[model samples]
Target: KPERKRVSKLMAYILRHSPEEFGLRPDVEGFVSLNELVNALKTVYPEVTEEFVREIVENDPKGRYEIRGDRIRARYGHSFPVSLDHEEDTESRFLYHGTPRRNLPSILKEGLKPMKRQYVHVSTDKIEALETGRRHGREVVLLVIDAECLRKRGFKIYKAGKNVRIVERVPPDCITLAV
Candidate 1:
């Protein structure tokens, strides 16, 4: 389990932040060849193989990576800019965005901004938001995003994976303080 976590971190670093550090490069869409990725990972994880990578991608609790054909890419949370070609899930009535109590004042005023990441990350469920908020501090606040209303207002919401969703920004009018 520890090995898997280590490998997941390594893969996240390689796919989301600095692929060049591993002697690999991601395409404009953030895809790197499976062979290249496996080779690059082998430098640190000598036992790393395509199968292990596939298993990690398929079974990660966060659903971090996506694989198609012979290429792989992180589904979300990229420090570098990449156009994500994912589909939208409009069936959901709401989404959740987590923030610390310290930032709630500003967020309530300005709505949710991406800050550093390319897009504002939201979770499809409150549990995911709660977990994400816990990473920041003790006093976690979950903001309920009106997905249906926002979508009707011409906002685009993309489903990054099973649990993660993203939007360019959320205007203050669409956010409701849930907790």
Candidate 2:
């Protein structure tokens, strides 16, 4: 089970970040030929197969990856450019963003920006947001994002997978520091 989880993380790294490291590249729509991905995985996961990869994609708890026919791509959380091809119009009432405590001052002043990835990540609830903060450090902070306020301000927000949402920006006025 741990081996498969390792494989999943590796897959996410390739699909969401550095496909070039594996000599593979996702197309404009964030898709790579499934066969190519399997071949690349063989270097690290010698026994990996398309069926196993497909199983992981289909059954991933967070629904982080998507497959159609012989191609696969991560649904969100991408650092590289790729067309998501779908948009969500429904408004989320509110959302939370997590970060390291050290970044609080700058964040509170400048607002939340997607430093590395293409869009800012927000969570559906405080619990999930806290988990994200934990990844950054022991000293974590959360920001409450008023999504209805965001909508009213004419900002576009997109739901990514089950746990994450993305927005182009969240200005300081819409963010509140939360413990």
Q: Estimate every model's Cα lDDT from 0 to 1.
A: 0.88, 0.85
The best candidate by TM-score is: 2
What TM-score, over all chains together, does every model reach?
A: 0.92, 0.94
Lowest-sum lDDT 10-residue window in model 1: 170-179
Assess the local accuracy of residue 84 in candidate 2 as a C-alpha lDDT between 0 and 100: 87
The residue-by-residue lDDT of candidate 1 on 114-146, one tens digit each, is 887788899998988888888988888889988
User: In candidate 2, which residue ranges exceed 4 Å CA deviation?
Assistant: none
Clashing pairs in 2: none
* lDDT (tens digit, per residue) of candidate 2 on 72-166: 99988889988886567475777898888899889878888888888888888788888878997898887888887778778778877687888
